[PDB]
Symmetry: D2
Amino acid sequence: KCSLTGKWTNDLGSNMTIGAVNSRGEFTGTYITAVTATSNEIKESPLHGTQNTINKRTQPTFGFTVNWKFSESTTVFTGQCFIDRNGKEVLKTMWLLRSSVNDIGDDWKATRVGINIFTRL
Amino acid sequence: RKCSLTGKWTNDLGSNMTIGAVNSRGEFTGTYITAVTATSNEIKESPLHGTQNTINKRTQPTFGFTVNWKFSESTTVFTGQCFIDRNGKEVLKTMWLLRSSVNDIGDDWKATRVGINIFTRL
Amino acid sequence: KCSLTGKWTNDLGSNMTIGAVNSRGEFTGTYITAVTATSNEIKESPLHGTQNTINKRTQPTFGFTVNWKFSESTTVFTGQCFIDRNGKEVLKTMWLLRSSVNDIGDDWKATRVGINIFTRL
Amino acid sequence: RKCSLTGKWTNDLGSNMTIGAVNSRGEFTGTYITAVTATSNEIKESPLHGTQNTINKRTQPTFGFTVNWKFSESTTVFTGQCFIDRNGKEVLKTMWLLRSSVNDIGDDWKATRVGINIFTRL
């Protein structure tokens, strides 16, 4: 089975570590991003999420939220934990990066989208 | 005035969710009761877990959460901001990604749907 | 049938006019946005797109590109032309707003996403 | 050095596209030959139409286009930027929305998929 537990790196140079996944699918971790949309100094940030455990898939879906500690933003990631053709694990994910806006009239411009592919560190 | 995630919410598709207390680290848990599904499965209350961003203790914080669906193999994530709207109402403006399970990594490209949800207090 | 031709307004206060849709599904129009992510002065911008004509649906899908004339950005919209429960036409759309970045290393942050609902003006 | 959309491109999913000349208004037409589909229909060459942004005559312009699929009722839009990569190669970095047709406006929420494509010259 593909398991989220462990250390990962992505295509932008960010790393994350995820701890034990419990019987309800819950996990916590830490994220160190290589990139930011702000001109703020990056700091390591917690993440929390779940793996879907329905039918106990060898390649489960999952999602997590990175609670950025150096900005007012939040990012969520979701994807699937695959075994690729080489037998290596790969997380294929898409994310939404939510920026803080001061006024609800600017809400429309607050959400960026993209992908990340993670492999084991 | 502050916008708080804790409590009961309903959305523009008829779904409800309950969010519990937000701890000092911004963490919260809740339950999601969806009105709609992409599958032909029975909907069932599913847990959610997420965080509110506490940097600068904003009155209108950003947040994100994951719904761990219990009636399908999918996962949805939501992120958005807890606003005080012009009328003084608390409103969650969110966008989501719904990740379906695929069997072959070759089909990964078609596995993610996107959309919005707007939540107000029940 | 729901037809894209005509004048529309959206939930953010933007308007657009779309001309005749030809037999291949092609149309052109003009977009006047009520909002921008830049601090530039908005100007009316051309759009070009297509309606899908397969099976000649009464509620077709469609897409179009707004070629912004007051910024370096581009937005694309896609959605479906519905008749709602009142018999009114509504365009339900989602969009990607692509900003220009100077360097490919910043590509990850260049795409915003959102929705717009259009009704007839 | 300029990145130009005109010519033949291939993507990370195996799809190809041909883009014709870009006129003074930034307009172009082309053909898309997709390797993948969300339906169980036969893929068939489909037309595309879009624009390149010409403001400030950037060497690495943004652009967008719509693929008018001819073998399904769906539409896809792409937007991105025509870059000169660090190795001097022209690369289209794009994101897309794939809109499926639904019969009932009530199902609109599940009709839009999202993803990326990276194109290089064939």
